[model samples]
Target: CPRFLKVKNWETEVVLTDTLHLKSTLETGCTEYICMGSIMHPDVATKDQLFPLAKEFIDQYYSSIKRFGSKAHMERLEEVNKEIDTTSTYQLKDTELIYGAKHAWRNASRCVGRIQWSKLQVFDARDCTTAHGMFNYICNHVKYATNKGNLRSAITIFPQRTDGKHDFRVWNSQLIRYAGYKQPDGSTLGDPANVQFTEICIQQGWKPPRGRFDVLPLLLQANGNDPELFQIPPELVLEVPIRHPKFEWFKDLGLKWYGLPAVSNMLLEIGGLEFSACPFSGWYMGTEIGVRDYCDNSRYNILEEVAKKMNLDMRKTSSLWKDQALVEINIAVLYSFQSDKVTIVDHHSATESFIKHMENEYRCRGGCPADWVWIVPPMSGSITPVFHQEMLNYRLTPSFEYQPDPWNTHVWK
Candidate 1:
C-alpha cells in the first residue's frame, strides 16, 4: 500500500485519503509552509505549451459568462489556435484582457485585499509603442487611482512580451517612492529602501532634491531600450501627513506617505501571454505603512525616536516600549488617513474581510490557496482570526508574479 495521510476540511469535516487527493492536499500544505512556487522557466512559451494554456483560460473565461460549450465558444477556440499557429501568439480581446487582469488580482495569493479584486479599473495600454507613451499612461493611471486621496484599485496593462529579448518594464518597485540620498558621513536620508534606485535616477540625468521625502522619477523602458527617466508631476501624487488623534507631538515628526500603493514591478500572466509592465494600485493597509515601512529597522527605523518621545524605557527588553510605540504609530497612520479622507484599511478590518473572502473562495471552488504567514497581520499575530485558521497555498494561473528587476535583466544598446 502506498503511504498516505488523511486530510480533513475543517468546516465540513470531509476526510480525503485517496492517493491523488492526498497528494494534492499534501502539496498544498507543503507549498503554504514553504511559501514558494515552482520556478518559472525563463523561456518563451512555444506553440505546444501556449495552445493548452490558452485553451484552458478560454474555457474558463467562456464558462464564467455561462457560455462554456456554446458554438461561439468553440469558434473562439478555433480562432485562437489559428492565430497562434500563424503568429506564435494571439491577442486577447478587450473583454478577455479585462477579465484576465481582474482574475490575476483574485488569484494573488499574497494579497489580503482580494475581496475588492473585481472592483479593479483595468486600463489597457497595449497600443503604447514608445517609452514616452508608457510614462504618459502611468501618469494618467496615478491620477485616476489617487482620485483626490479617495484611492481606487486600478491596473494599467502595457504591451505583452513578444520575443524574450525586447520587453517594456518599469524600473521602480512602486510607482510612488521617495528618493534615498547617501550623505558624506555614510548616513542615509529619505527612504533607505530606494538608495540604489535613487542613484540610478541621478546617473540618468535626474537632479537630486536631497529632501527627506522627495518623490523619485519614473524609469521606463520600451522595446528593451535603455530606461528613460520621467518626473511624475507632483500634483498627481497624493500624500497624507501622519498625525495622532491623542498625541499632539506626533505631527511634529513630519512623516507622510503616499495615498496609492501602486506596485510597478509585477508581471501579469494571463493565459500563456506575459505582460511585462502591468502596474497595479490598491489603498495601503495600516500595518503596511505603520509596522513595516516606518518601524522596520531596514526601512525608516522610526521606533526608537517615537519611543524616546513617548518617554518609554527603551533599554529594558521587559518595558515593551517598542510595542507601545508601534501601536501609537499605527494609530497615527490610521487617524491621519481618516482625517484626510484618504483610503486606508486597518489590520483588524482587513483580516476580518480576508476571512470572509476565504470562505467565499472555498464555497465557489473546493479550496482556497492561502499562505498563513502572509494572511496574518505582521504586528498582532495571535490576536487576528487568520492566525488561528489553517491555510493551504498553491500556485494559481492568471496570477500576478514577481519578475526580474528590469535593470538586472536590461541589455544596453
Candidate 2:
C-alpha cells in the first residue's frame, strides 16, 4: 500500500551558497535611495539602444487611452522621456503603473488571454518590505483572484530597483504549490513538477506535512535578507476536488487542483528596468492541468492508470488509448472546476479566444506573435483553430521573461 507521511526534519544543515551581502537602508515601507539609472545585466541592451522600446510602450499606452476615449496624458509622455534623458529613470505615476502592467500582459507572446489584457487588476505593493507585509499582500491576492469562482487576472508588483538594493523576491515559484517528497521506493509523493523546489524548501527550514497533497509554504524575502517561510492559512487556498462525470471511482482518486495558477517567479522588465519579483495570475485552461501537469511523462503520467480504468484496449496499436484517456481526464478537470463553481475555460474555448485575440492584436498592432505549439491545445490539436493557423513568433519589450530560479541564481562574492 502507498502511503504519505508528515515530516519536520530541521537537522539536515544546508549551507547557504556563496552569497553576496546586499546592503541597503530600509525606508518608510520600501528601501529609498538614489540610483544612477536602470541597472543593466551584461546581456541586456544599453540605455541608448533601448529608446525605441520605451517609445513603443509609451505609444501603446497613449493609444489604449485614446481607444477607450480616456483623458489623454500627452504631456506626461514628454515628461517621462525628459526624465529618462536627464536621470535615466522616471517614476511611474499610478496611471502609468496600471497601464504598463496591462500592456505587459498584451506584450506577453506566450499568454493566450491577451484579449483581456486591459482588464488586469494591478496591485501596487512597490513599497512593501517586511515578509509579513508581503504575506498579507499574497493572501489578499489569492482571495481576490479566487473571488469565490469568478477568477480575475491580477498581478502584484514588489519594490523594483530604486537603488542597488537586492530586488524584493517571492522565493516561491507560485503562491500555491504542492510539496513533492521523493520516497525510497523511487516514486514522488506529491507533484513531480515541484520536487526540486520542495527539496529547496526543506533545506531552508520548511516543515512539510509530506502528505500526498500538502500545500507548500510561502517564501518571502526583502532586500539584504534571506527568505522567510510563512505558512498560508488553508482557508485562503481555494482548491477544486476533481472527479469524472461518469466514473464514481474517480472521486476516490483524491485528485484536486488549486483554483489559481499565480506564477510568482518571472522577472518583469518594463522599459529598461526589471521588477525581479512580480507575481501574476490568470484562470486555468483545463489542458494545462489535465494534459501537461497530470499527463506529461515527467509530470503525473497518469495515462496508463486512466486508460486501465476506462477499460481501453491497451494491447493494440493505434488503439488511441492514451489519446482517449487524455480527453476524459481533461473532461474531468473542466467539469470539476466548473462544478465547484471555480472559473476555468475548456481547451476549445481557450483557443477560440486566442483566435479572437490575434484578430484584435492585428487590428491594433499590425501583427501578433505566438508560439503555435503553445497555442494549440494538447488534447485536440487539429480540432482547435490555432493548430492550423500560422504563428510568427518574435521578441518584444515591456514584457516578462523567465529568469533562473532564485535559489539557483546565487549572488557573487
lDDT of 1: 0.86
Give per-candidate clash totals. 0, 1
The digit string of per-residue lDDT tens for model 1 on 283-328 reads 9999999999999898999999999999998889899999999999
The per-residue C-alpha lDDT of model 1 at residue 64 equals: 89
RMSD of each: 3.7, 14.7
187-278 in candidate 2: lDDT tens per residue?
Answer: 98888889998988898898888887889999887763678889988888889998999999777778898999899988887756678778
The top-ranked prediction according to TM-score is 1
Give the best candidate by lDDT. 1
Can you tell me which runs of candidate 1 are displaced by over 4 Å? 1-42
Error of 2 at 29 (Å): 40
Pairs in clash, predicted candidate 1: none
